[PDB]
Symmetry: C2
Subunit: 366 residues, 2 copies
């Protein structure tokens, strides 16, 4: 018999969607190619709860980041998911950069982020004794979250509403059925075929390629699949700052974020590296260029202190010389396929936006 | 513009093409994402020089395997590339399988493979004392090759004719210029954009995805990109057979090949496992089902003797329930794009066919 809804991918976004579908009374099967939940791009990010500052007005990134932030802070408090509203400084390290702050704060305001504080460098140093900057914007609503815990929590909720998750179960090929619904061929060690009424393609890095593997999805609707890797490095011995530090959006060349984990340890990154294949191997040498970038706002960074961290890969749907694409949530109104939502290019701030992306997917599926 | 011919991929097929274009007088640049040559599917295969036996009549696999074999044996002998014409038995392990051998031999003959010997089980045992079968076909032209040495030889040839190879240089995005030629965005330590007159996409597992990242290549022309992994297990010590041993194609369930390397060690596999992502991790549990399959023809396979080997992934352009697609060699006559050849689905016997694939690529380019 048909399963009602199949969600492909058990990342944070796939799980938020499964959770929403199951809460709506639908039978849900989540198929994940990996051996567990949240091993993918949901385990290789900064884990920052973003405020919604610099996304373009009315973009999905802007709307879903701000809505998602509110839903997520409430969810974390309600469910006891570890998180901290520790705040962030966007720091200007030259007079030219300091001049950029006013417009950045106005963009945030227009997105519904109305708590930014514009302060001078001396004020910023009062807040953060180790910090060297010309001026800053304080973003008090920016936080951090344990994304693994968040994933498990979404999973728990969905299961409580009858969802079933099946691991090491890769979707290989599918077809839109003439009569409606989908027929799906799964691979791995135990290949099998299942059919369903609703299909959610939340496959992340692989969503566009996977859509191309489903007969009946228009090929002109599917974006190209690019990969933009990011590497993080860690700092042993407890952090020099109590808030996240971000250079200005338009900072020239490499902008190194200083972020914090829940245990209080600082990490640096991610950088940007366009690559041809899905390769998570950490190149420790990529830290070399971090030093001068970080020392612009934290000159006390010691030599050799940037220890190997980890990598992630962003799902890109536009190329290295194009302006960044918005999130793509493609439902029947754009591709013409009843019962299908493809999600493409859910890079940052996808974790922050996750519960809002779930809302929007259901809205579009309708 | 910058560059006459650019070849994407330094696997055995990309190198054969680069060698042919350079020999034809073209300035050639080969761009490879990895650090050296042949680190892709060209490093994870059986290394068998196939005879041309079972491929569909008039297919590219049939024609290029047979032509390729003759060119390859000549090349190896002329240049000193290590190889062995060891021969192969196709073995029937039941009365029903034995009844299939005549039609297999007829197919081979139609493909231009005229040297198969149809013999009984006793005769087969005289050749291979450890074999248990009802009947067999001997394929004396089947062999094995040192594929790394082969690729180094191809590279040397191309370089002798002016070719340049650049590594850690992934092609990220590109576009077809309306006036002809291509503009290509490369990553790596120093990202750069280059233009060229001729573009050969020999990107293997990623060829279809890469084609989709080149604006101007008709999207309907580009097949889906599937991945079909295969696992191998090795046998420590003395090999039981002096020829390769293949069960008949229509063998029920898993057919396990027994092949030999140039050092005389036996290995078993590969199996078939359709997967979602490029993961080469060997799962030792996959050997469990090999035992019964191998024992159909080598019942003396000892308990526990299947040691972890390695895996490879086949580039597929048709799905698990479709007939195996032919090699894809997609020039201007098919997609309309001047100076472009895309190679897709170059799985086995692509190593054997490599020099013939290069011939066909140049023919189709022109
Ligand atoms: C370096 C980096 C830093 C980031 N930092 C932040 C941040 O600080 N704050 C923030 O809000 N966001 C951040 N993000 C974004 C956030 O990490 C992602 O938006 C989020 O994890 C995406 O989750 P997802 O479910 O869409 O994708 P994924 O976690 O990638 O899940 C997709 C799943 O699909 C599975 N899959 C793929 N193909 C198949 C198939 N054929 N069959 C079955 N399963 C399949 C995969 O195994 C995977 O588990 C960052 C992203 C990156 C890359
Ligand atoms: C398990 C297995 C066993 C096999 N056994 C046999 C056999 O016994 N006999 C036989 O004849 N054939 C066999 N084959 C087939 C043979 O291995 C292949 O046909 C051959 O290796 C393919 O070579 P290639 O150059 O097309 O691909 P590859 O070797 O995969 O080369 C593609 C190259 O492109 C590069 N690349 C990808 N994307 C980019 C990018 N965007 N930019 C720059 N570079 C990029 C990759 O890094 C890679 O090096 C086997 C195949 C498999 C999977």
């Amino acid at each position: 018999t048909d399963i009602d809804c199949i969600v492909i991918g058990a990342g944070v976004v796939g799980l938020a969607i499964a959770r929403a579908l199951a809460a709506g009374g639908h039978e849900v099967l989540v198929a994940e190619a990996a051996e567990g939940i949240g091993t993918g791009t949901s385990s290789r990010n900064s884990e920052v709860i973003h405020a919604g500052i610099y996304y373009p007005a009315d973009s999905l990134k802007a709307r879903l980041c701000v809505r998602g932030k509110h839903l997520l802070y409430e969810y974390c408090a309600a469910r006891g998911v570890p998180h901290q509203r520790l705040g962030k400084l966007i720091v200007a390290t030259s007079d030219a950069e300091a001049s950029q702050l006013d417009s950045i704060a106005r963009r945030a305001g227009a997105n519904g982020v109305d708590d930014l504080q514009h302060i001078d460098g001396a004020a910023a140093r009062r807040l953060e004794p180790a910090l060297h900057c010309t001026a800053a914007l304080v973003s008090p609503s920016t936080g951090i979250v344990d994304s693994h815990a968040l994933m498990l929590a979404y999973q728990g909720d969905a299961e409580s509403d009858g969802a079933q998750l099946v691991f090491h179960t890769p979707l290989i090929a599918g077809r839109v059925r003439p009569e409606g619904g989908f027929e799906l061929d799964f691979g791995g060690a135990e290949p099998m075929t299942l059919s369903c009424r609703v299909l959610i393609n939340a496959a992340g890095l692989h969503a566009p390629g996977l859509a191309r593997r489903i007969e009946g999805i228009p090929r002109d609707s599917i974006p190209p699949e690019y990969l933009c890797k990011g590497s993080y490095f860690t700092l042993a011995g407890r952090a020099p700052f109590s808030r996240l530090i971000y250079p200005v959006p338009q900072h020239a060349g490499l902008g190194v974020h200083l972020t914090l984990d829940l245990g209080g340890q600082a990490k640096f990154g991610p950088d940007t590296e366009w690559i041809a294949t899905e390769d998570y191997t950490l190149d420790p040498r990529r830290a070399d260029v971090f030093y001068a970038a970080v020392r612009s706002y934290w000159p006390a960074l010691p030599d050799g202190a940037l220890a190997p961290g980890y990598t992630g890969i962003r799902p890109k749907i536009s190329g290295p010389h194009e302006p960044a694409a918005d999130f793509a949530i493609a439902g029947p109104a754009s591709h013409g396929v009843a019962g299908l939502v493809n999600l493409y290019g859910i890079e940052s701030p996808g974790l922050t936006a996750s519960l809002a992306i779930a809302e929007e997917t259901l809205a579009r599926l309708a």
